[PDB]
């Protein structure tokens, strides 16, 4: 289970798409 | 007085399946 979670887990203003992907991460990883 | 973006991140999620 460690090994599934490793494998997933692979100026700010210029930045914020950025926090667009956590938020996909955040739906990616617990969809 | 951004929808490449998406796509591609789905890209990579489902590279990690």
């Given at each position: 289970e460690?090994?599934?979670?490793?494998?997933?887990?692979?100026?700010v203003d210029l930045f914020k798409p950025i926090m667009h992907t956590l938020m996909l991460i955040w739906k990616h990883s617990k969809s | 007085k951004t929808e490449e973006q998406l796509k591609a991140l789905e890209d990579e999620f489902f590279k990690t399946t």
């Open positions: 460690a090994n599934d979670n490793v494998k997933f887990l692979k100026l | -």
